[model samples]
Target: AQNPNCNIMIFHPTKEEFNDFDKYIAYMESQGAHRAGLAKIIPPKEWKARETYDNISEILIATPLQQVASGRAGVFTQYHKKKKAMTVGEYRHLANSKKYQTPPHQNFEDLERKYWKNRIYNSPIYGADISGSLFDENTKQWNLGHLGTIQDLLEKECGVVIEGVNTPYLYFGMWKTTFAWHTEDMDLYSINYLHLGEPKTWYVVPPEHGQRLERLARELFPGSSRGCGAFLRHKVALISPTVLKENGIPFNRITQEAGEFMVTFPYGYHAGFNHGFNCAEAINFATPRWIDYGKMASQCSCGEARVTFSMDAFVRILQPERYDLWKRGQD
Candidate 1:
């Protein structure tokens, strides 16, 4: 039997990929990138890497904020720790300057050989409340250009509103700033766009095997089964591709380059590392197919049923137009 979901898909965008917005949307939807599995959309040229950071640094870097990380002091990886708050300008300077000789921010050349050598990171902007963020105010500077057109439709026209769920998360990573294995909220799809610096290594498991991987994680780290915050509170159990292969679990690997957009599918398990000091932004999105998962996610996270209203509204008002566009391809 064929798997209902896909493993991983990559789309290379040349000149013609953006000519017709409606056709492009339908093409992506047909790939089932939202539900079946992980996907990547690689643009032909660099889009906003240089300008976005320069603009961000000039605007928001002076604000002092608490930055978090997994300090390098664990058996497999580092343990989670909250670093002292610093101005975003100071953090950016510290990250890029190899001469500073900091414990976690040292420069290294061979990334794969010493994958766990540097400190893992979650940028200060990770927790920023995007509701009133300046980035949204200057959309052209922060937006991912052509890549975000469909996302805008889903959020704007579809009425699939959620507080900060679709907000962009900025990431600043050096050497081993690793994101541990996990799924997106309510298993909605996520789009991560690497704006600048070194490429990130990603590992993705198919949705069909996500539960199996979770079971394996529980068995491997019995302590993780303690509660909801175990993975968040402690060092994330970082599983390598070699380990997955040894355990007979199939997976896909990608070294996502600058200007590439990685789209993780609903319910797929993904984890990865930054090869060097890099900047990226991630945001989540959902279609009509995501209603069930969104409902379940709302219940688990908030103990209330709040996602239904947006889902119902989108289905009634926005979904039919996209549905017809997709159906037109058959004719």
Candidate 2:
């Protein structure tokens, strides 16, 4: 589109034909993944994310202690504020969230409980309080259930599809569930990983070159639909900082992409979990369909929307930055 292609890498698809997946990896390795002409990292399907693995293990260990109470009347947990000492559960949910809530004086909880209870009853396909515990006391953790049937029914009945391609597993943490910011879908689609606990912390960096793109959009465009920065069309680039942390520990960033980055796009619209930590639990991630499974997978997870996380989203999202500005030319 914009050329004579000065600052841009040229696009050249692999000329070599392949019957299976490994060949592509071999090709990228030969050409160098940065020079492979794709904007995002695409790791092999066999990859395992340590966080996901450990988290899964933690969840399993905690499962033995799940306590079932009234499947009908979920218990109410309360917290007090700093002037009155708030509960950790209550604080976590509100700390980093974006979802709006009713003021304490509004009697919001009663209104919400009534609405949701009503929804469960009249809705053709709905369920409530399948969970039985306050927390898995044994493991000292909580849980989440993927809305498979709800996803299905929504897609089938309403034709309202939640775009899946680079969807990440939603995580519940302190306030709202948190998604450390990152880019996705070759930058064509804005992605989010909405969760259901206290909002967790997030970080972001502006691409050194086009860093102001998003800001310009906000001021000049003033209400345009798209936000900006971290060029998805430009290719993925992350660089790990070799520098030690405050504790003298080394840390990592999505340094695989080449330049500046951020957890959320500039003007990126995202919210952490809603309400208090012990209240509700669930969330989802979303991204554009560029390298999605419908275009990539063979056996499909749920009609056209679902793809095995192993094969796609997890790999792309978990890719750490690959370079660090180690000893640059004395500047």
Candidate 3:
């Protein structure tokens, strides 16, 4: 119970109490674990499910630009050789539209449909304090969950927009969609809640062993070492649990179900796959613990430095009193 290692944990709240998305956010925030990872959470009925969005055309006419195909143009796909980028709408249109009148081409059996089944897409609507937008006219139709209140505090306190880190994003996946092994940006924490889906299988390595795992990864992918700068070309890797176990490193396996949440700690290495069609919303938020960690981790020289720290400027704008105290201490 007291260990801070990267062990998976699960919690089941009473359906009556944890029924609403807003209530669930409050419940998570009430605990000191505003950034804690939840292996699984059985949410109540009021939660919106992905199946509810069977016909996107019925409620919405177009998809946002940010809602593009996942793994399309990022460094992560370099390992997979070559690929074609397609948005969710285009993929659907090609596969289901009568205008195309396409037949199921069984060209290579498993290989023919593999790419389609694994196609993952991102959704544009995001934010931590999304309660206001939760029931907004436009938002009411989509499948989303209200989560990560800590980010709301960050935006309010800092008066800056920290995209992807503090702003949550939605990921819709089909069978075989994988998020390669990597830690949170800037050693920060992330919360991922599955709105509706089959399940996502995950493998996690604790922070204590994160460095070792990185070294091992470099060894496996030569040129991925720190100085080569190839490491930043793509951060995700396909590291197996058996390999980590064989190396004597401890890790955990979790199959996250619908309504469950997953939280990752600083420098905690994690990778997972969606077992089937599913939609999940995830966002990164920080606690005081992350400040020092970000500064120290930045020294490693990982490409472009995924973590951004503008606290000094942020303090001047939003926390001048605290900034004044800090300045006086410096004097």
Candidate 4:
């Protein structure tokens, strides 16, 4: 009955609980976290209370791992349109088709093969981004799509097992400029991973019901940062089958290292500290959620890195290679 990957647990705060959310504000202050990074958790009410145009919360705080009602945390992004924005793949394809006048400047091959080869997300980054809202008029900035398929793929790619075969959900749904920490409709465990970048800031909350989790995430902390492109894109979040009471990893305790890794289930609160230089690679994957990721993680995170959610551990082995988008020696 004990989840092997996330077997470690105690009734209350663990020594690693410092990695959770209670101390989000303190951590951010220490690093001079930006305001744009913390905007995700700023309550709509708080934003409303403040001046209309001045209500830039998501910029300061990263959103929680789940929705408020779902008792989970979600991934966050900067640009979200009501329609399918465009897949990083499709855009590249078009870019190389001669019509766009430029060839594909980036090669997601390793990122693709390592993570998407045997999975459903084959369209490249741009295509995945546009899949949800290709033709929904009233979608708003938060138009969700490919929920069941993405969820299924998550089970297959990641190692997490899904309880119900048929359901409407994802590993988690994120907002363009919002923040929250809640549980899911079903019994689920999770491993939350943050690829620290560009000195961003966020907050996590202690264990509570799904609704309360969301409510707390919306609470704004002072001295945070905000921005459009400062958040993670190919980020990952791990969910467990068992509901955690507390004992989940927190943020403050995170031992920041060039290759440090952190992993934990849904339990107590945790928030981001700052968006340092290029926090572009924070990735979280769950079991049975995405099949392709299983092998990918095995070969990468759990494979060579020797990290796991059960131990509340992680590490950044090395940053991805940067793309040379210009002709050699042309300048």
Candidate 5:
């Protein structure tokens, strides 16, 4: 059954208004956005948007694409993977390819059905740390590194550079590229900026029902999550919102477009797909609320090779100096 409502909160903040990320988020919260768990931002239409990033043409990388994954195809080939290499410039070619963009048929659903048959889509180009590179480019140097990004507070306050956490990472996406439903590392608050390109569809499950969503995924795909109950959290699995609704999990949908941002609340399960070619950069941040969420979310059961945070350091940093003095005073 289709979830006829895509009722997530949408914030329309001018460029200057969005300059202070936290303030905007606070405003969103004042409107009870925290309950929604996903904030869809449509920055002022007048805001300037960028078409490319620095050295994008020179940068080359490889990413694995799922062979027919998600919704229905996604579940069957959840384990299938293959890698392809291309330059950022080359990827742009396919993303903007006239052959690919021109509809195979006039009907939208029929176009999707026919193209999806080829089954070679799924690339997020996730986690390319660009914190250092951003400083070099004037136009692209806004989002995370800007004075009011809030995420940099983690680096400035805690003597820690959590790579993809506090620092910004660039992402490249094309049609149907899926980012599976998963919480951020330690379930931290995260935000993504759609620098430019096609609109991306986002589905978010509120934190209140996060556990129930996991339970449903486990019950439905026991074989995958059996080995690792956090399989969905691995950011490698996908499920359509209809299936989620059929199983009684409340889900919200939002469309993030160019010159806009999306902020994800901790413990909110988020997954989405791109319409066509686009480039987005994202990073994670934290608030006092995430410490408890972080403790409960660990990478122990998941089998994967990627960046993982030292939760011990994350927890200790909160009250290290105060706790140390208190520890000695007790003795």
Candidate 6:
């Protein structure tokens, strides 16, 4: 066999193990999972993302949405952008319009002829609109759900919610929709839950091979890389596994099924697409461990603007007795 695929570590945690999220992640970090940049948690069999808040359609209208991995409809959502303001119901109705249900003719640029237009990536549960209206029916206490995990430590220190990064964003995935290669804002750690969906295929570059993967990206997308400090953040780059294999980069893939979670470490580069129509929510968190990495990060360029934040004051604010003893970790 030639050009074998490298594997990402996956964990099958029991009920007790999954419940202690912080401890489980710490153990994983100790096991060197963070170096891989991404890991998958299969979770307990008893777990359910929803008791019955069957609001997928409503969510589609409320906000934003991806495509699949197998050179199928996923490419449509990524490579092509359809600019139309549509409600969730209209989007859903238009999504199944029979034309998009078929294969993309993936490798070539036959897009406009075979397709018309529709849909987009929209909304945040973290932002004001629609969040309160969301929790109406389903309330049984699922610790892993984004709603319960909203009160993160980052907000505690600053009293400011950093939108989808520090707060949470909800996403809708239509068949073959894509989320291109990118790291979270401030290179923070991000956790995504497939509340309910077909599945999402994630591709990640390990810590050691991050540079290798990046070099290939820069070499290919020179103009963009040269232009913006956050080139990958543009969500335009899409490299296939074959390219990664050719370049000898150690790339890994994980399929996040419904109820499963995909966790990415700080500064780790990752991207993926959806398998089918699904709904997911993601939030980024700052861990005490992320300090060393954050300090070393270069200034992010959103059109070569500003970096209005502090590091020493951030560190200076950390040493007090306003924390600890409350348990559930983070001390």
Considering every candidate listed, which one attains the maximal lDDT? 5
Q: What is the C-alpha lDDT profile of model 3 across 1-331, one tens digit per residue?
A: 3445534656566656554544554454455332333344555455444435544322221232222242332222222222244544544343233422223344333322342343333222211112111122333322233444444545655455543323456665554556667776556667677765456777777666776767777766564564543353244455555567677766777778776767676666787665545566776656555555544442223333222343344334444455565334323
Model 5 over residues 1-331: C-alpha lDDT tens digits? Answer: 1112424777778757856656777677667676667887776665544434555665554653543454454342344354576777887776667644433455544534543443344433322333422333444323554533333455665455543234577776777666777888657888888876776778898887788888887877787776764677556676665577678888887778777778898888898767667777787777655666765664423435144344334534544543343233323
Candidate 5: residue 29 Cα off by (Å) = 1.3
lDDT value, residue 144 of candidate 5: 58
Candidate 2 whole-model C-alpha lDDT, 0 to 1: 0.25
Structural RMSD, model 6: 9.3
Q: Write the residue-wise lDDT of candidate 1 on 93-195 in tens digits.
A: 7656663222343443345545643333333222121222223333332254323433455566445543322345566655456777777655667777777
lDDT of 2 at 244: 16
Model 4 / residue 243 / CA error / Å? 26
> Which of the two candidates, 1 or 2, achieves a greater lDDT against the reference?
1
lDDT of each: 0.54, 0.25, 0.49, 0.24, 0.62, 0.55
In terms of lDDT, which candidate is stronger, 1 or 5?
5
- TM-score for all predictions? 0.66, 0.21, 0.59, 0.24, 0.75, 0.69
Better of 1 and 4 by lDDT: 1
lDDT of 4 by residue, 51-156 (tens): 2212211221122221112212322222222333333333324334432221222332232222212112111111121111121334221112212332444445
From the highest lDDT down, the ranking of the candidates is 5, 6, 1, 3, 2, 4
lDDT of 2 by residue, 200-294 (tens): 22223322223233333233333221422222221111111111122232222221111111122222222111222322222232222222422
Any idea how many clashes model 4 has?
Answer: 119
lDDT of 2 at 45: 33
RMSD of 2: 21.4
Model 5's lDDT to the true fold?
A: 0.62
lDDT of 1: 0.54
